[PDB]
Every structure is written in C-alpha cells, then in structure tokens.
Design a protein around this nucleic acid. Structure first.
Ligand SMILES: OC[C@H]1O[C@@H](n2cnc3c(NCc4ccc(O)cc4)ncnc32)[C@H](O)[C@@H]1O
Ligand SMILES: [K+]
Ligand SMILES: [K+]
Length: 545
DNA sequence: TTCAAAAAGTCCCA
DNA sequence: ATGGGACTTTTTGA
C-alpha cells in the first residue's frame, strides 16, 4: 500500500514549491504532505529548509529575536513550525518520525505527524505549501462503505466511476493558504476522462494552474501499471492566467537521463507550450498551436458527429467469460443447439476495415427457457462455474438466474451490419462487421441511423475513420491510458465529427477497393497502403489541412 | 430495467 | 530476476 516516488521527481516537486520562498519575509512556512508515507517528500523538504535557514541565519538573527535564530536552533524550529505530515499507515509515520528525529534528550521536540485519514481530519489551519503523491484507488478497489462517505462529502469532485485521488485534489486545494503553492504527482487520466469533468472544473475555478508535466504512457513507477502527470498550482492573485505544459515526446525514455528533471523538460525529449486557463472548457485541450489549428479546422468544417448519425452500444458482459465462451472446435458445443450459439470476437480480431474470422462461440444462455429442458448444457458446461456465477450482483438480488448472462444486451443490435472497434488500441481500427459478430466490452459497436443512411454509408465511414487524418484528430482529445494505448470508448468516439462533400464518392470507392483487397485469399497488402495514401490526400484536401 | 466507465491494469517471457 | 510487450474482465454507479 506504499509507493515510492522516484527521487528525481520528489526533488523537482519540492523545488517547484520552495525555490522562490522569501524566508526573511516569512520564516514560518507550513509545508504539508497528507499522504507522506515514510517521508519521501518531507525528508527532502527538511534538507531544502535547513539550507534555506542556514544561508540566511544572520539576516534572521538581525531582523528578529537574535537569541532564537541560531544555527543550532534550526532543527528544532523546522520540526515545530514547518514540517507537517499525515498518513493512514501507523508504521510509516513511526519510521518518518524517527527519520526526522535522526536529522540532528534535550527537550523532546514535538513533530507534526498525524496518523489518520486525511479526508476526515479536521484541519485546524491552512498551509503555505502542499506536496506529495496521493493514493490512487478506483471504483472497483474502493470499499463501498467508504464510497458512501465520499459521495456524500466530496460530491463536488467524486461521483460515479471517479477515483480516490480526486478527493485528495479537493482536500489539498481547500486547505491551501491564499498565495500558497501545491505540487503533486497523480495519474494523468483526469485530464481527459469523463469522470474527471467535475474535478477539472473544481481545479480551474479555485486555483491557478502553473504547470502540467504530462508523461503520457511513460513508466514512471517501476512495475506499476499507471501513467503519471505532475500538477503545480497556486492561490496567488495574478492577472496572468497561462499554464506551462510540458508534454513528453518519446515514451521510451528513462527518467534518470539527467541529474535533474528540469534538464529533461528543457531538452528535446519534451515539448513545451502555453494554454490560457480562461479558455479551458469542460474539456482541457492541451496541445500546441499546430494541433489546435488542425483540431479547430476539422471541428468547424464537419457539420455532423457520429452521435448525430449512429447508435452506439457496448458489447456483451457475461459476468463470467469462462462459463459461456468456448472455442468453436470444442467438443462440448455438440451439446448446444446452434440457435444458442453466436460468433464471438476479441479486440485483437478487429483490424482496419474488416474483422478476422471468429474462433470462439458465445452460448447465449438467456434463451434457455428452464433448467429441465437443457440440463446437459447447464450441468456440463455452464454449471462448472455455478459458484462464481451465483456471486454476480444480479444473481444475488434474484434479477438473473445463475446461468444467465449478466448483461446480454439486445441480440438484434449485434445481428446486423455494423461497425466495430477495439476499446483500447494504438491506432484507429474501425471495421465493418458482415458476420453478426458478438463481443465482450473490449469491442464497441455502432450502426447508422436509418434517416442518415442516404447521407453516410458504412464504407465511407471506415474510410475516413481509419485515415491518418482521423487517427491524429481523435488522439488530440483521446484518453491516453498506457504506452501506445488510447481508450476508444463511446464517450469520446461518438464525439468524432465527420463531413460530406465532393470527395465523398472517391473516398467511398477507395474504401471499397481496400475492403475488396483485404477480403481476398491472395491478399495484396501492398496496394492497400497506396490506396490509403490516396484517400488521406482527399481527406486532407477536403478539410483544408 | 439495463446502460457504459474504469488501468497504482494483468500476464508472460527473455 | 526485471523490464518490456501483447492484450484486455466484470464490477459498478447511475
Ligand atoms: O502512496 C499512498 C499513501 O497514502 C496513504 N493513504 C492511503 N489512504 C489514505 C488516506 N485516506 C484514504 C482512505 C481510504 C480508505 C480507508 O479505509 C482509509 C483511508 N488518508 C491518508 N493517507 C492515506 C497510504 O498509506 C500510502 O502511504
Ligand atoms: K535582532
Ligand atoms: K505507464
């Protein structure tokens, strides 16, 4: 439950908040970490503070009580008035307390360390500087009893599938003094995610965001599947409202390339651009001027969105795939009448323009009337996981029988011509499904509304949607998950805007040529790339880019 | 009644 | 052993 932040990032975060502190004007700064752990940040705060006091000790001695301000008194002063920490783990607090003590009995100095829940603590005062790495706990791994507390007391930032670190953002902001500075490393997903919409609104309207360091899919925490960003914000009265954005360019770099993180930020490994905080909508579109011009051209030119013209839906959720999904060559499928069997595909089966032939079959068990008529299917296939099936939420409440699919959706939505795409991918992969394929929630589908069929065809749509233009266009606002992975979920895919002009016929014809080649047995892959290049030129011409 | 979001992902191998 | 790559379930709030 304890995570170690890399030292190069700890040093950067502490420097970001304290490098320009006027210790002569205010020799009593309050620096807080509300998930301090063993003290990765606080122990570094001590070192920075000690040099700060020692470098100006005679100036403080002259300006203030000359007996109080001596070098031998710096250690006691820092612990009494400057360093504050909180963590739920008692053992970590005890270790940090020893570490701070060992920086030097005489007078039994008191240390401001609290073993508590930082989201419930009654904070008796606000703080000049707040740093640290909060806990990240999503909606599956958080206790329901605790989530009831969060939904009640942190509703301004925490609803639905929000994360625990949203609340730490709110708590840090609320107890930051006027003119104070906060700097934290959290997951990056709130920058684009639907869940973070309220959190983004809370940050934008309560603090000035100085800087966002976006590591994208780079691996900052070794052996941890998370993508990181560093946010620095303040409560200073400033007319200027511009954010420094540092966005990494190569996700494969090692974080220890230089001795300092700021060396990496200034280098060619990162790009820098500024964003006007006043121009942030509910979405934070953090791109350079070239991409903003590119994005705005497409938005203005396109009069339709996919949501306008299409019906979206998520795939089947069985609740226990091993009980219902079988290999098409499994001998146990001889027990299942073919009326119960559906073709089943995974996200990896989706390519551009077409789906691979399915290798798995879904038992649509919802169509099994009762347990007596098809006892063989229940006893020998589905019942092998009856205990796990009975633990599903809708089975415990009696809504579903133990052998039914948890979310079987509507069969008629899948058994039709439609477009399918993987839920997480490195690139746009929109395919026309001709084979009534079913899938789990790792594949999303949509079909065109009847009233828009004479304006848009499936062949045209997969043409533009798979183009290099729309690959770049979608990724401008897409949710970056891990290295070379973006979420392709309807909450953003359905916002993709599309156009219709004089190039419609040739774009559609090129797409049909690609599909015809891809479906050939002696498939000529090379010519497909040439046709794609020609289609990209038409699309770039159509959108004036 | 029933939708869709959510990576401190998960798992394997060189 | 670790770091990097291939691939992606079902729990959950609304
Ligand atoms: O690296 C993360 C670090 O933060 C610490 N930490 C995790 N959760 C909390 C916390 N409130 C949230 C909460 C949630 C559920 C609870 O049953 C109880 C409390 N309040 C303070 N510190 C917390 C950890 O111990 C790690 O040292
Ligand atoms: K004096
Ligand atoms: K990562």
């Amino acid at each position: 439950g304890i995570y170690y932040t890399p030292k190069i990032i700890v040093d950067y975060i502490v420097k970001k908040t304290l490098k320009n502190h006027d210790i002569i004007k205010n020799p009593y700064p309050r620096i807080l970490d509300i998930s301090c752990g063993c003290g990765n940040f606080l122990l570094e705060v001590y070192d920075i503070l000690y040099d700060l006091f020692e470098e100006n000790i005679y100036e403080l001695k002259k300006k203030y009580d000359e007996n109080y301000w001596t070098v031998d008194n710096i250690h006691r002063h820092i612990l009494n008035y400057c360093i504050y920490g909180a963590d739920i783990d008692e053992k970590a607090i005890s270790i940090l307390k020893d570490s701070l003590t060992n920086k030097k009995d005489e007078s039994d100095i008191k240390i401001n360390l609290f073993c508590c829940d930082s989201l419930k603590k009654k904070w008796r005062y606000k703080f000049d500087y707040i740093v640290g790495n909060p806990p990240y706990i999503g909606h599956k791994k958080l206790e329901k009893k605790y989530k009831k507390f969060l939904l009640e007391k942190y509703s301004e930032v925490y609803k639905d599938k929000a994360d625990l670190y949203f609340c730490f953002y709110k708590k840090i902001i609320d107890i930051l003094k006027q003119g104070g500075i906060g700097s934290v490393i959290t997951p990056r997903y709130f920058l684009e995610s639907l869940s973070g919409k309220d959190l983004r609104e809370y940050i934008k309207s309560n603090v000035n965001v100085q800087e966002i360091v976006d590591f994208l899919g780079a691996n900052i925490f070794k052996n941890i599947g998370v993508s990181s960003c560093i946010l620095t914000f303040d409560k200073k009265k400033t007319k200027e409202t511009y954010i420094d954005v540092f966005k990494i360019k190569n996700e494969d770099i090692c974080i220890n390339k230089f001795e300092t993180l700021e060396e990496l930020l200034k280098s060619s490994k990162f790009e820098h651009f500024n964003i006007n905080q006043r121009l942030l909508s509910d979405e934070w579109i953090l791109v350079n001027k070239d991409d903003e011009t590119f994005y705005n051209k497409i938005q203005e030119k396109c009069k339709y969105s996919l949501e306008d013209i299409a019906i979206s839906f998520q795939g089947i959720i069985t609740g226990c795939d091993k009980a219902f999904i079988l290999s098409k060559d499994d001998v146990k499928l001889n027990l299942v009448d073919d009326k119960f069997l559906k073709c089943w595909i995974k996200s990896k089966n989706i390519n551009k323009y077409i789906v691979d032939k399915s290798e798995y079959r879904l038992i649509y068990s919802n169509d099994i009337d009762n347990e007596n008529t098809n006892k063989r299917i229940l006893d020998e296939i589905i019942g092998l996981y009856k205990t796990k099936l009975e633990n599903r939420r809708e089975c415990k409440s009696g809504i579903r029988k133990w052998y039914e699919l948890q979310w079987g959706r509507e069969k008629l939505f899948f058994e039709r011509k439609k477009i399918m795409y993987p839920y997480k991918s490195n690139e746009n992969r929109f395919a026309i499904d001709y084979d009534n394929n079913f899938s789990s929630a790792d594949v999303y589908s949509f079909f065109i509304k009847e009233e828009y069929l004479d304006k848009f065809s499936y062949e045209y749509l997969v043409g533009i949607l798979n183009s290099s233009v729309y690959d770049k266009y979608f990724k401008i606002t897409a949710k970056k998950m891990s290295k070379n992975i973006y979420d392709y979920y309807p909450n953003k895919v359905m916002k993709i805007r599309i156009f219709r002009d004089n190039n419609y016929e040739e774009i559609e014809n090129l797409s049909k040529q690609i599909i015809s080649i891809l479906l050939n047995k002696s498939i000529d892959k090379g010519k497909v790339e040439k046709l794609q290049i020609k289609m990209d030129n038409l699309i770039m011409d159509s959108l004036g880019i």
